[PDB]
Design a binder for this molecule. Sequence first.
Ligand code: HEM
Length: 293
Amino acid sequence: TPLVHVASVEKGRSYEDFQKVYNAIALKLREDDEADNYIGYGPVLVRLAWHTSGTWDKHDNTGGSYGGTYRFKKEFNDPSNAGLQNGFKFLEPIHKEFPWISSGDLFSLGGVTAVQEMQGPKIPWRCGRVDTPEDTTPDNGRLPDADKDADYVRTFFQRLNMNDREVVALMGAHALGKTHLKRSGYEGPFGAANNVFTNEFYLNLLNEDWKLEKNDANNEQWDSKSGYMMLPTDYSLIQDPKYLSIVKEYANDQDRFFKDFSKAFEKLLENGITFPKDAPSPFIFKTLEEQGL
Ligand code: HEM
């Protein structure tokens, strides 16, 4: 059984150091507001954090956030990762200012920072991801297909040790951003507020009038009269009776959805990492707004 990946704190660093990195990311989020027709870089950094963590296989502990392997061509050229190069470019000048942070820690922190700055829940975050060599890069094809049903989604996420509630909560990130026809074969914003984190993914599934249409890439997606879109895999969460209960739950309780997302998101970003008994506790970073910055 599995590789063991032990978190090792960047030498001599503590909370204040990582807050500084969070702050640099958050300040650039605010400065580079123009990206994607004023959506900005928040959604793409969340997706980058998810895709670099979502390669994890619980059976042998390959993939995962630990190794920061997205920096290698095999993984950055994963067709599943198309468009994430923009997030990597965003983070370039951050990594240059703080060259002491590991790539794993930077990608996952990017995602925490974007969620919190887009007014989502606090996500405790732990340091100590260590860059691993190019031969540790997971092969392509570990991230999920969008054209599939609820049974697919349930089985898919068992590999990442997520249960129904964790799956439904994580999928609420599709409040954020949009599909881009050239990136994935799907096109259109997921919701109304593309760069504000809310439970609107659940309210939209339940409340909008959805039509199954073919987009310009000849792929089926669900389109609402409002101008939103959901993937077949999104919509499957209201087709499956067990998912649909959880959807209705988060639709009706913003705070529960926040708490559940934070835990599931932290878990996702931490799968495969052994934290020593003596490792520091998880950091909860203040937002710029909380700091008066
Ligand atoms: C069955 C599971 C999932 C599937 C099939 C899926 C698939 C997709 C696809 C095809 C796109 C559009 C990519 C593009 O064209 O730009 C997308 C966007 C996005 N996904 Fe997911 N996703 C899944 C779960 C997740 C999770 C678990 C998260 C994070 C918690 C997440 C975060 C995002 C974000 C933020 C975007 C917007 C990216 C942007 O606006 O640039 N997704 N997803």
